[PDB]
Scaffold this active site. Structure first.
Site, PDB file in Angstrom:
ATOM      1  N   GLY A  15       5.800  -1.234   5.517  1.00 63.57           N
ATOM      2  CA  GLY A  15       4.562  -0.625   5.346  1.00 63.57           C
ATOM      3  C   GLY A  15       3.527  -1.513   4.590  1.00 63.57           C
ATOM      4  N   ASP A  45      -0.307   2.590   4.459  1.00 58.83           N
ATOM      5  CA  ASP A  45      -0.230   3.559   3.494  1.00 58.83           C
ATOM      6  C   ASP A  45      -1.512   3.589   2.465  1.00 58.83           C
ATOM      7  OD1 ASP A  45       1.913   5.277   2.027  1.00 58.83           O
ATOM      8  OD2 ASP A  45       0.882   4.519   0.440  1.00 58.83           O
ATOM      9  N   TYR A  50      -7.233   6.916  -3.041  1.00 59.12           N
ATOM     10  CA  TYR A  50      -7.494   5.614  -3.044  1.00 59.12           C
ATOM     11  C   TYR A  50      -9.082   5.245  -2.731  1.00 59.12           C
ATOM     12  CZ  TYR A  50      -2.380   5.328  -2.621  1.00 59.12           C
ATOM     13  OH  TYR A  50      -1.294   5.419  -2.691  1.00 59.12           O
ATOM     14  N   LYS A  79      -2.084  11.300   1.853  1.00 59.29           N
ATOM     15  CA  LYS A  79      -1.498  12.002   0.924  1.00 59.29           C
ATOM     16  C   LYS A  79      -2.545  13.236   0.335  1.00 59.29           C
ATOM     17  CE  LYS A  79       1.279   7.866  -0.547  1.00 59.29           C
ATOM     18  NZ  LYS A  79       0.136   6.852  -0.438  1.00 59.29           N
ATOM     19  N   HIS A 112       1.190  14.109  -2.973  1.00 61.93           N
ATOM     20  CA  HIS A 112       1.330  12.862  -3.385  1.00 61.93           C
ATOM     21  C   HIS A 112       2.028  13.008  -4.940  1.00 61.93           C
ATOM     22  CE1 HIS A 112      -1.536   9.217  -3.697  1.00 61.93           C
ATOM     23  NE2 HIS A 112      -0.509   9.100  -4.463  1.00 61.93           N
ATOM     24  N   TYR A 211       7.451   2.297  -3.259  1.00 59.84           N
ATOM     25  CA  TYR A 211       6.105   1.586  -3.625  1.00 59.84           C
ATOM     26  C   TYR A 211       6.238   1.109  -5.053  1.00 59.84           C
ATOM     27  CZ  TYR A 211       5.183   5.304  -7.167  1.00 59.84           C
ATOM     28  OH  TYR A 211       5.393   6.083  -8.294  1.00 59.84           O
ATOM     29  N   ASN A 268      -4.595 -10.384  -0.273  1.00 54.19           N
ATOM     30  CA  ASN A 268      -4.632 -11.974  -0.180  1.00 54.19           C
ATOM     31  C   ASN A 268      -4.180 -12.364   1.298  1.00 54.19           C
ATOM     32  OD1 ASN A 268      -3.146 -14.582  -0.324  1.00 54.19           O
ATOM     33  ND2 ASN A 268      -4.619 -14.824  -1.666  1.00 54.19           N
TER      34      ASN A 268
HETATM   35  N1  LIG Z   1       2.467   7.407  -3.887  1.00 52.10           N
HETATM   36  C1  LIG Z   1       2.085   6.944  -5.144  1.00 52.10           C
HETATM   37  O1  LIG Z   1       1.962   7.812  -6.105  1.00 52.10           O
HETATM   38  C2  LIG Z   1       1.933   5.632  -4.867  1.00 52.10           C
HETATM   39  C3  LIG Z   1       1.695   4.787  -6.276  1.00 52.10           C
HETATM   40  C4  LIG Z   1       1.529   3.272  -6.420  1.00 52.10           C
HETATM   41  C5  LIG Z   1       1.464   2.659  -5.092  1.00 52.10           C
HETATM   42  N2  LIG Z   1       1.582   3.479  -4.053  1.00 52.10           N
HETATM   43  C6  LIG Z   1       1.573   2.518  -2.694  1.00 52.10           C
HETATM   44  O2  LIG Z   1       2.246   1.432  -2.674  1.00 52.10           O
HETATM   45  C7  LIG Z   1       1.296   0.445  -2.307  1.00 52.10           C
HETATM   46  C8  LIG Z   1       2.101  -0.947  -3.021  1.00 52.10           C
HETATM   47  O3  LIG Z   1       2.296  -0.618  -4.696  1.00 52.10           O
HETATM   48  P1  LIG Z   1       1.203  -1.440  -5.565  1.00 52.10           P
HETATM   49  O4  LIG Z   1      -0.287  -1.319  -5.056  1.00 52.10           O
HETATM   50  O5  LIG Z   1       1.499  -1.125  -6.753  1.00 52.10           O
HETATM   51  O6  LIG Z   1       1.573  -3.007  -5.354  1.00 52.10           O
HETATM   52  P2  LIG Z   1       2.638  -3.866  -4.948  1.00 52.10           P
HETATM   53  O7  LIG Z   1       2.877  -3.748  -3.529  1.00 52.10           O
HETATM   54  O8  LIG Z   1       3.951  -3.577  -5.775  1.00 52.10           O
HETATM   55  O9  LIG Z   1       2.169  -5.273  -5.338  1.00 52.10           O
HETATM   56  C9  LIG Z   1       1.650  -5.681  -6.484  1.00 52.10           C
HETATM   57  C10 LIG Z   1       0.776  -7.018  -6.293  1.00 52.10           C
HETATM   58  O10 LIG Z   1       1.715  -8.236  -5.974  1.00 52.10           O
HETATM   59  C11 LIG Z   1       0.798  -8.994  -5.343  1.00 52.10           C
HETATM   60  N3  LIG Z   1       1.387  -9.672  -4.162  1.00 52.10           N
HETATM   61  C12 LIG Z   1       1.578  -9.159  -2.943  1.00 52.10           C
HETATM   62  N4  LIG Z   1       2.397 -10.043  -2.166  1.00 52.10           N
HETATM   63  C13 LIG Z   1       2.681 -10.989  -2.858  1.00 52.10           C
HETATM   64  C14 LIG Z   1       3.482 -12.180  -2.847  1.00 52.10           C
HETATM   65  N5  LIG Z   1       3.902 -12.423  -1.512  1.00 52.10           N
HETATM   66  N6  LIG Z   1       3.696 -13.056  -3.543  1.00 52.10           N
HETATM   67  C15 LIG Z   1       3.172 -12.795  -4.946  1.00 52.10           C
HETATM   68  N7  LIG Z   1       2.291 -11.530  -5.202  1.00 52.10           N
HETATM   69  C16 LIG Z   1       2.169 -10.929  -4.306  1.00 52.10           C
HETATM   70  C17 LIG Z   1      -0.495  -8.401  -5.057  1.00 52.10           C
HETATM   71  O11 LIG Z   1      -1.692  -9.073  -5.302  1.00 52.10           O
HETATM   72  P3  LIG Z   1      -2.634  -9.673  -4.235  1.00 52.10           P
HETATM   73  O12 LIG Z   1      -3.430  -8.336  -3.633  1.00 52.10           O
HETATM   74  O13 LIG Z   1      -3.543 -10.424  -4.921  1.00 52.10           O
HETATM   75  O14 LIG Z   1      -1.727 -10.403  -3.097  1.00 52.10           O
HETATM   76  C18 LIG Z   1      -0.464  -6.899  -5.470  1.00 52.10           C
HETATM   77  O15 LIG Z   1      -1.523  -6.841  -6.619  1.00 52.10           O
HETATM   78  C19 LIG Z   1       0.005   0.685  -3.040  1.00 52.10           C
HETATM   79  O16 LIG Z   1      -1.185  -0.056  -2.507  1.00 52.10           O
HETATM   80  C20 LIG Z   1      -0.051   2.327  -2.430  1.00 52.10           C
HETATM   81  O17 LIG Z   1      -0.548   2.023  -0.867  1.00 52.10           O
HETATM   82  C21 LIG Z   1       1.588   4.621  -3.774  1.00 52.10           C
HETATM   83  O1  LIG Z   2      -1.208   4.117  -5.536  1.00 53.47           O
HETATM   84  C1  LIG Z   2      -0.968   5.265  -6.078  1.00 53.47           C
HETATM   85  O2  LIG Z   2      -0.501   6.022  -5.206  1.00 53.47           O
HETATM   86  C2  LIG Z   2      -1.141   5.675  -7.277  1.00 53.47           C
HETATM   87  C3  LIG Z   2      -1.131   7.058  -7.748  1.00 53.47           C
HETATM   88  C4  LIG Z   2      -1.280   7.155  -9.147  1.00 53.47           C
HETATM   89 CL1  LIG Z   2      -1.107   9.117  -9.882  1.00 53.47          CL
HETATM   90  C5  LIG Z   2      -1.823   6.081 -10.018  1.00 53.47           C
HETATM   91  C6  LIG Z   2      -1.999   4.923  -9.371  1.00 53.47           C
HETATM   92 CL2  LIG Z   2      -2.702   3.688 -10.544  1.00 53.47          CL
HETATM   93  C7  LIG Z   2      -1.448   4.458  -8.064  1.00 53.47           C
HETATM   94  O3  LIG Z   2      -1.811   3.541  -7.832  1.00 53.47           O
END
Ligand SMILES: NC(=O)c1ccc[n+]([C@@H]2O[C@H](COP(=O)([O-])OP(=O)(O)OC[C@H]3O[C@@H](n4cnc5c(N)ncnc54)[C@H](OP(=O)(O)O)[C@@H]3O)[C@@H](O)[C@H]2O)c1
Ligand SMILES: O=C(O)c1cc(Cl)cc(Cl)c1O
Ligand SMILES: [Zn+2]
Length: 318
Positions: A15, A45, A50, A79, A112, A211, A268
């Site tokens: 995703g 996602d 967001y 969500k 969520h 995530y 990126n």
């Molecule tokens: N349900 C929830 O509560 C919840 C919570 C957190 C996240 N999420 C969802 O899960 C997603 C992903 O989690 P996250 O946003 O914490 O980020 P993540 O996917 O864990 O990635 C973190 C960082 O890694 C960098 N990155 C991506 N690909 C890379 C690569 N190949 N090499 C080096 N760095 C790389 C990105 O920066 P660049 O953009 O600069 O590449 C990004 O800032 C969120 O966007 C959201 O859709 C949901």
């Molecule tokens: O990505 C998310 O779902 C999310 C949820 C919460 Cl509650 C807080 C942060 Cl910083 C998040 O990125």
């Protein structure tokens, strides 16, 4: 590839994450999401939280319009935010996401986070002294209203996020349940590998969706800056070098081989196109065991603003 959800529907195992830190301009979500689709991502996602559901919708709809995909090829998640847990507010919240997106349905709609906050258009509502305004809502009523969203066809599948074993049970064991959650979307990565909770979701036919699989965005004040940086891990880097891949690609493949559906955010263009190549290589059971040893009980996203209420999910063992 794809996994079959407990409702007969299929979810692409990789995703595209669309959350970006508040400092990141909305426009960037639209270009990134189009780039992800052109790269090969088919699972996307987002969430009301967001503040990008207009941009992502635009991105998805332009890729349909130019003939790159059809709607049926895109698996889109939204969500329900904490300010709309009350049963009467659940369908309005979904309908508003749909309006913002300009789509007729979401493929997935999640609760969520299991702590409720006061209804209103503040997503984190605070009293005049800066203290959070928590609401009191039976999550079983929330679930029931989410189920009606499925009956309505507005959400093809329904699920939860940030739920612990106890809160999953409350749902599965609830009288008159019509639909199990298809998934529990939770933090998961080689520092915090969720084994005990992964085994539990598996036992109930609930997909674990990970995530912050690349160590999280590390946005303050949400994530502690003093936390180790997952993608600097020496074993992930040695694995990256052995296989001619990167530490990210290793982190992601780990999740796929252990029966976990995995998210990856990048805005990126190079990183987007890179992340979809998780499918071109494999890890041996011995290397998977190596990555199992990386667990260190590091939870990046505590959501501890929301610690206090009995519903706070992360006090329990899992
Ligand atoms: N349900 C929830 O509560 C919840 C919570 C957190 C996240 N999420 C969802 O899960 C997603 C992903 O989690 P996250 O946003 O914490 O980020 P993540 O996917 O864990 O990635 C973190 C960082 O890694 C960098 N990155 C991506 N690909 C890379 C690569 N190949 N090499 C080096 N760095 C790389 C990105 O920066 P660049 O953009 O600069 O590449 C990004 O800032 C969120 O966007 C959201 O859709 C949901
Ligand atoms: O990505 C998310 O779902 C999310 C949820 C919460 Cl509650 C807080 C942060 Cl910083 C998040 O990125
Ligand atoms: Zn290998």
């Amino acid at each position: 590839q794809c996994v079959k959800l407990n409702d007969g529907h299929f979810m692409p195992v990789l995703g595209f994450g669309t959350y970006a830190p508040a400092e990141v301009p909305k426009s960037k979500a639209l270009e990134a999401t189009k780039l992800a689709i052109e790269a090969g991502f088919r699972h996307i996602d987002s969430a009301h939280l967001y503040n990008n559901e207009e941009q992502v919708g635009l991105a998805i709809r332009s890729k349909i319009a130019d003939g790159s995909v059809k709607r049926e090829d895109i698996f889109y998640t939204s969500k329900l935010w904490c300010n709309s847990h009350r049963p009467e507010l659940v369908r309005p919240a979904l309908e508003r996401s749909l309006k913002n997106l300009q789509l007729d349905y979401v493929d997935l709609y999640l609760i969520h986070f299991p702590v409720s906050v006061k209804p209103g258009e503040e997503v984190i509502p605070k009293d005049e002294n800066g203290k959070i305004l928590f609401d009191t809502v039976d999550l079983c009523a929330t679930w029931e209203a989410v189920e009606k969203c499925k009956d309505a066809g507005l959400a093809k599948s329904i699920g939860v996020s940030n739920f612990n074993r106890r809160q999953l049970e409350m749902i599965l064991n609830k009288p008159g349940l019509k639909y199990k959650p298809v998934c529990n979307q939770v933090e998961c990565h080689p520092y915090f590998n969720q084994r005990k909770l992964l085994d539990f979701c598996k036992s109930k036919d609930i997909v674990l969706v990970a995530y912050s699989a690349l160590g999280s965005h590390r946005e303050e004040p949400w994530v502690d800056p003093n936390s180790p940086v997952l993608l600097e891990d020496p074993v992930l880097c040695a694995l990256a070098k052995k296989h001619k891949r990167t530490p990210a690609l290793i982190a992601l493949r780990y999740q796929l081989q252990r029966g976990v559906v995995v998210l990856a955010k990048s805005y990126n263009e190079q990183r987007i196109r890179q992340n979809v190549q998780v499918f071109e290589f494999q890890l041996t059971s011995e290397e998977m065991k190596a990555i199992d040893g990386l667990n260190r009980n590091v939870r990046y996203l505590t959501v501890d603003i929301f610690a206090g209420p009995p519903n706070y999910p992360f006090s329990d063992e899992y």
